[PDB]
Paper text:
The SARS-CoV-2 main protease (Mpro) is a cysteine protease that induces scission at 11 sites within polyproteins ppla and pplab, and its inhibition blocks the liberation and maturation of proteins required for viral propagation. The active site of Mpro contains four subsites (S1’, S1, S2, S3) that accommodate the amino acids of the peptide substrate (P1’, P1, P2, and P3). The Mpro enzyme has a stringent requirement for glutamine in the P1 position, which occupies the S1 subsite. An affinity selection of a 4-billion-membered DNA-encoded chemical library (DECL) using Mpro as bait produces novel non-covalent and non-peptide-based small molecule inhibitors of Mpro with low nanomolar Ki values.
Finally, we synthesized CDD-1819, in which a methyl group replaced the larger propyl group at the benzylic position and a naphthyl group replaced the substituted benzyl group. These tandem substitutions resulted in Ki of 5 nM. We also determined structures of Mpro in complex with CDD-1819 and CDD-1845. Of note, the unchanged benzimidazole ring is in the identical position in the S1 subsite for all three compounds. Both CDD-1819 and CDD-1845 contain a truncation of the n-propyl chain to a methyl group that resides in the S1’ pocket. The most significant change is the replacement of the tri-fluorophenyl with naphthalene in both CDD-1819 and CDD-1845. The naphthalene group more fully occupies the S2 subsite, where increased hydrophobicity is consistent with the increased potency of these compounds compared to CDD-1733. The addition of low micromolar concentrations of CDD-1845 (IC50 = 2.39 μM) and CDD-1819 (IC50 = 2.88 μM) was found effective in restoring the normalized cell index, indicating that cell proliferation was unaffected and virus replication was completely prevented. In line with in vitro results above, CDD-1935 showed little inhibitory activity at the concentrations tested in contrast to CDD-1733, CDD-1819, and CDD-1845 which all showed potent activity in a cellular context with IC50 values of 648, 34, and 98 nM respectively.
Numbering used by the authors:
A (entry chain A), B (entry chain A): 1 to 302
């Protein structure tokens, strides 16, 4: 029993992290086969970021302008290209530790593990969620650019995030592994800011199911709500609308606990309208929204 | 910026996890050099656990009674011995992925990363703390016995915990890697239970320093307290006594933020006496006590 913020084992990703140096700036890169992936703003000076034309800036660079270091051995760059906002450095050596992997662009509300890295060396691992406003509330300092987020399914590492920048509110913005930013953010020094955020409703419900699985029932009630009447309350408390697909996704958890999905919704409605009254759920005094239904199944069932 | 429950990268430990099978029971083992470490109750039937004499039970076993499987390859047991409550199976092959490692017995209040494992395959990683009552609030299901806890310093893996059992309250008890249980617990089916627990005061203070480092100051005040007057309040709220050594340990964090340790104590005193009044600290509505001063330095400074 028990319930924790569980990250995936990071070993398969640790063997892929390298250090990329262009000029006076150094960040992290992802080494898969004979290609190293890193944010394209590694080629930019501080003055370049005011209004960068990356096509113009990259054509002035050559292969020897990039130093790739994997642990102790230096990797030679034999080719470079630009795909959206990620730079791809072809190297003469294929990574022998390359795992089975995919590149996946995730939806808001989905979770992933983050391997925080500095100078190509892994520093720590933690679980994150893609917020509805397409930021992540990570833990990143200077030099963490190029750290990646990922999920693991059986044997395959699904990379879904690469860290690019920190917004003024202290939250973080990045791209998928093919260089497309999540949200409206761009790799340029401008006045962009994180938009208003909402609570991931389907995740709160899954986490309430996790509490029931672990033997906590104090928040349940005898009531049921309609999907429409629940979403009227969700809108009032800045919660994401609950769809029929979300209800269908919560099916297995509802079947294991014997609590209908719309019954759990009436419980969440009561929790939003009255608060938690000094009690806690799974050790938290707040409704937690960074566990997907799949996260709960993975941990409460192994 | 940001602050998360950060576990250590688990790659060095993943390469050491194996599966140990004795009879009809299977659990996890730790493979370092030519020795596999696992809980000694792997040799026990359910009826053996009522009043086991492990010396008597192990002398009836032979090397071929143990099946050790590292991924796909089966490892041959060439010797077995018992050290306190851990069984040591000598194998004919030394683990090529053996990292630099120590065995360390930690103090209550210290934190470590847990690599939850099932059938020798890593399932997830999360951060834990040794509670003052010598239990851990982990996330473990059936088959997780043999999973280990660890810290990493530079290149060395300091193993400090091996999972043995789950107590009736759903918390977990285990040993160091030399077989000595934390707390008064024993590997026998008896009516043992977790004792009353307390809050790790020095950790709450470090976590308040982390909040200041990340730009939050709403809980600070102009007041100071004496160490004796603070401990009078700590005792009232089931907090661990704060020692001069704890004050000295919080030195670097106090120097970086410019907030004296006893000044932070007056802030914590006010927080305990009035609550948090609907506000949050680092995204939590409760005072968090599973970050050591070293944990905060590691994450807020990289
Ligand atoms: C809005 N700025 C940004 O978030 C900048 C500062 C960021 N940084 C980080 C970094 C990553 N997580 C969190 C951070 C917190 C504090 C300081 C730095 C970081 N680790 C880095 C490693 C190497 C270089 C940079 C850097 O500074 N690069 C320069 C060329 C730069 C300048 C302005 C930029 C504006 C927008 C996007 C990218 C921009 C990029 C790095 C990119
Ligand atoms: C108080 N019981 C226990 O916590 C028992 C049940 C535990 N278990 C776990 C396990 C580990 N985390 C959490 C669990 C939650 C639910 C069920 C099992 C676990 N994964 C296991 C993998 C293999 C075997 C066992 C097991 O069941 N072994 C048998 C011989 C046993 C029986 C009674 C015991 C009493 C005390 C100590 C050890 C005892 C051990 C395993 C050891």
């Amino acid at each position: 029993s028990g319930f924790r913020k569980m990250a995936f084992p990071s070993g398969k990703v640790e063997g892929c992290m390298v250090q990329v140096t262009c000029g006076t700036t150094t960040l992290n890169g992802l080494w898969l086969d004979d290609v190293v992936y890193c944010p394209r703003h590694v080629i930019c000076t501080s003055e370049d970021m005011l209004n960068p034309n990356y096509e113009d800036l990259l054509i002035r660079k050559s292969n020897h302008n990039f130093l790739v270091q994997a642990g102790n051995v230096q990797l030679r760059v034999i080719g470079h290209s630009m795909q959206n906002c990620v730079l791809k450095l072809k190297v003469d050596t294929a990574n022998p530790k390359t795992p089975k992997y995919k590149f996946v662009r995730i939806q808001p509300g989905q979770t992933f593990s983050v391997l925080a890295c500095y100078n190509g060396s892994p520093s720590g691992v933690y679980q994150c969620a893609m917020r509805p406003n397409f930021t992540i509330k990570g833990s990143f300092l200077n030099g963490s650019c190029g750290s990646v987020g990922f999920n693991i399914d059986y044997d395959c590492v699904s990379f879904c995030y690469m860290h690019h920048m920190e917004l003024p509110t202290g939250v973080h913005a990045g791209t998928d592994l093919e260089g497309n930013f999540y949200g409206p953010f761009v790799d340029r020094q401008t006045a962009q800011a994180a938009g208003t955020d909402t609570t991931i409703t389907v995740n709160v419900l899954a986490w309430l199911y996790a509490a029931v699985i672990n033997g906590d029932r104090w928040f349940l009630n005898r009531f049921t709500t309609t999907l429409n009447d629940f979403n009227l309350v969700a809108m009032k408390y800045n919660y994401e609308p609950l769809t029929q697909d979300h209800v269908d996704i919560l099916g297995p958890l509802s079947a294991q606990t014997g609590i209908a999905v719309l019954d759990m919704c009436a419980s969440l409605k009561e929790l939003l309208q009255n608060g938690m009254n000094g009690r806690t759920i799974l050790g938290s005094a707040l409704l937690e929204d960074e566990f997907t239904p799949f996260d709960v199944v993975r941990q409460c069932s192994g």
